[PDB]
Amino acid sequence: QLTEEQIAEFKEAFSLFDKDGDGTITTKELGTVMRSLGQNPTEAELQDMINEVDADGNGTIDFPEFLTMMARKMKDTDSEEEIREAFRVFDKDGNGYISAAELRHVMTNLGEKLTDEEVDEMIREADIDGDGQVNYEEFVQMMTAK
Ligand SMILES: CN1CCN(CCCN2c3ccccc3Sc3ccc(C(F)(F)F)cc32)CC1
Numbered sequence: 001q002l003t004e005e006q007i008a009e010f011k012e013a014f015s016l017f018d019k020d021g022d023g024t025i026t027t028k029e030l031g032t033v034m035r036s037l038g039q040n041p042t043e044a045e046l047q048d049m050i051n052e053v054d055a056d057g058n059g060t061i062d063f064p065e066f067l068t069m070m071a072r073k074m075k076d077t078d079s080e081e082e083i084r085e086a087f088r089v090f091d092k093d094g095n096g097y098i099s100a101a102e103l104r105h106v107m108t109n110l111g112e113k114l115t116d117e118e119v120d121e122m123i124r125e126a127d128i129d130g131d132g133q134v135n136y137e138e139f140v141q142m143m144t145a146k
Pocket residue numbers: 008009010012013016107112113114118119121122
């Protein structure tokens with residue numbers, strides 16, 4: 001079940017979307033985060049994404065709704081392609097490995113300022129074989145909660 005550590009981590013993640021700190025993520029905020037990741041949704045696709053997670057139907061996502069979404073899990077059968085595309089946003093040089101440098105660049109473009117200690121830790125926790133990098137297989141497992 002949801003650990004307290006995961007809750008604080010998810011609250012941190014929540015703040016990457018909730019730019020203005022008003023406690024809700026709007027389509028505008030979702031749009032700017034997606035664009036920072038090289039994605040380009042239309043105002044309509046942005047609305048569908050919010051509506052899939054919007055529980056009380058008020059058009060925006062508050063922390064409980066985000067936590068709920070984040071809390072839940074699915075198998076790798078759940079669009080391996082989405083995972084593939086996400087991997088590609090990190091693996092900027094296309095070599096098949098996410099380096100600490102690549103992880104840092106992505107985070108910075110997202111507006112998250114990590115030190116060296118934090119980047120290595122994020123890497124260390126996803127790294128299975130111990131080479132200090134995250135390959136696609138390691139990435140998949142991080143995502144599929146297994
Ligand atoms: C001031 N100092 C700034 C950096 N933040 C957290 C750094 C990134 N971070 C992180 C890194 C290592 C170990 C735990 C965590 S919590 C966390 C949760 C989500 C994200 C995310 F957002 F990337 F998904 C990033 C982090 C801690 C406080």
